[PDB]
């Protein structure tokens, strides 16, 4: 009963941060095996920042430049290479806390959970969407580049996030765990546009459907609409198409609730069209879009 | 920067979940040195919900009727006993991931995390706050416990034990005592009249202007009394001065009296927000403490 954001249990994630420093600059880093990985401009200084030369900057750096601490432990840097924008320090010792993982590329409108940290420590955990424009909107004070967003399997991490920057916009931008960042960023300091961002249709329609089993059923109706006619409404409220993968992602939820998928559509596009009147939807007079049918379904019934 | 209902790292208490099981009962229980901590109902049948005496139902319950399993391995049950509304089963294994801890007792309107489990494996993590009716909007997940962690020492203050008829939850302390008026039995109870955390909405209003959403600001004032008298027909917590001295190091962070604040959040219950968000929400948010804006900020 009840519905929240939840996120991942972070114990796995905990005991793989760590604290990089080099030169002036200290910020996370995550300990998996033998292998440290963080934001390669954790070799920048504050006169580097505008368009840095991160071949050269790294080729002034040998091992014994990076201080890289688990809790009250120094590791051994034996090794260091720069893959796209994260830096992989070779260290003597082996994570004895390595979960089972993956490394994972994710796409825009799915998501996970971030553990932030400052300086190699954890500080919370919270649940958060890839936005369509591959930004996230989180929380990430100065000190926070490296955490990372990750999601679990059943005893397998899979890394999916680590965190660079902020955009002169206030959100925030990143890479994978090979480096590549999600969207158009580049890790320099320089303002950067991030594309018009769209609402995640599926996972709105989700969250209707968790409203339904929770009894919030008001915005209900029996109206129908089609796929195409739905999505002529969904590009006028700026929300994104709605594909027949994603029904057929949705179909467990229509399922348990004996909902058509456009039938909840068509439901949708009332709320799209007229509003909420003041009403509220498990709490809330927005739409939320921070669940996918996965987490939806995870929740009622997970671990 | 930015600004996110965010949980504590759950590590320290992942290591501390066990599953128990009595008779045909499985729920979650928390092992912290020697002693697992559970919910008492696990020792009810199905016939027992409606009235049970749990002296006698104890009773007739030995240490072999327990089975506390930890990940891979059964513990071995040399004791039990009653606290109030939780069993304690003595074990004779410490356990050892056992954080540095201290069980606390939290009042209405203070936070903490949650980690949801089931029959003894963590699903996920969230962050809430005790209604001022001491129940609880969350979501076999019994004997999940709500904590929150200073440094390295986690302060266990909520175990939850039963879903009310109207769907939120109740539990008590970790000595076994019930927040609110709630019993553990099967009968209807009623959660007083909820009313919002005042001093949650401020915090959060100040966590706004931190982050550049600073439109619902004015000058026009108000005293403790004025507004007071507003929060009591909104179904809003009376703002005590307890209060205003903790949300003082938001104040002198951001340069805005606390009344000012107040005679802020005055028009926004009188007005509404005319169609206008503040961090990403519309409507007033009162699950972060003052503590809990400073130490995100
Ligand atoms: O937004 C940025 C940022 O937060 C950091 C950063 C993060 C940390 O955690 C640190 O410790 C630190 O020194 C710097 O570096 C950047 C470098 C760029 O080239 C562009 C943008 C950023
Ligand atoms: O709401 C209640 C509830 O959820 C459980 C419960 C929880 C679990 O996790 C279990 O595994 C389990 O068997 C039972 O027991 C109750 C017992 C009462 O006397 C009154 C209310 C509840």
């Not at 409108?109 to 954890?122: E, M, R």
């Not at 965190?163 to 300091?189: S, W």
């Amino acid at each position: 009963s009840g519905f929240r954001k939840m996120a991942f249990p972070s114990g796995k994630v905990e005991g793989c941060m760590v604290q990089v420093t080099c030169g002036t600059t200290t910020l996370n880093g995550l300990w998996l095996d033998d292998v440290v990985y963080c934001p390669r401009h954790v070799i920048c200084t504050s006169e580097d920042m505008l368009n840095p030369n991160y071949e050269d900057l790294l080729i002034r750096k040998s091992n014994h430049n990076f201080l890289v601490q688990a809790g009250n432990v120094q590791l051994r840097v034996i090794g260091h290479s720069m893959q796209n924008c994260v830096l992989k320090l070779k260290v003597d010792t082996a994570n004895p806390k390595t979960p089972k993982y993956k490394f994972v590329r994710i796409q825009p409108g799915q998501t996970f959970s971030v553990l932030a940290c400052y300086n190699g420590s954890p500080s919370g955990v919270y649940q958060c969407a890839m936005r369509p424009n591959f930004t996230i909107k989180g929380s990430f004070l100065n000190g926070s580049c490296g955490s990372v967003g990750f999601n679990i399997d059943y005893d397998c991490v899979s890394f999916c996030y680590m965190h660079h920057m902020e955009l002169p916009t206030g959100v925030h931008a990143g890479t994978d765990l090979e480096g590549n960042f999600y969207g158009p960023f580049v890790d320099r300091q320089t303002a950067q546009a991030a594309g018009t961002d769209t609402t995640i249709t599926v996972n709105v329609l989700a969250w209707l459907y968790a409203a339904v089993i929770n009894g919030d059923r008001w915005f209900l109706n029996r109206f129908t609409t089609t796929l195409n006619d739905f999505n002529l409404v969904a590009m006028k409220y700026n929300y994104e198409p709605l594909t027949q993968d994603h029904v057929d992602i949705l179909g467990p939820l229509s399922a348990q609730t004996g909902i058509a998928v456009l039938d909840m559509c068509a439901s949708l596009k009332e709320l799209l069209q007229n509003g909420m009147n003041g009403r509220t939807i498990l709490g809330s007079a927005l739409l939320e879009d921070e669940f996918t049918p996965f987490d939806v379904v995870r929740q009622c019934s997970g671990v």
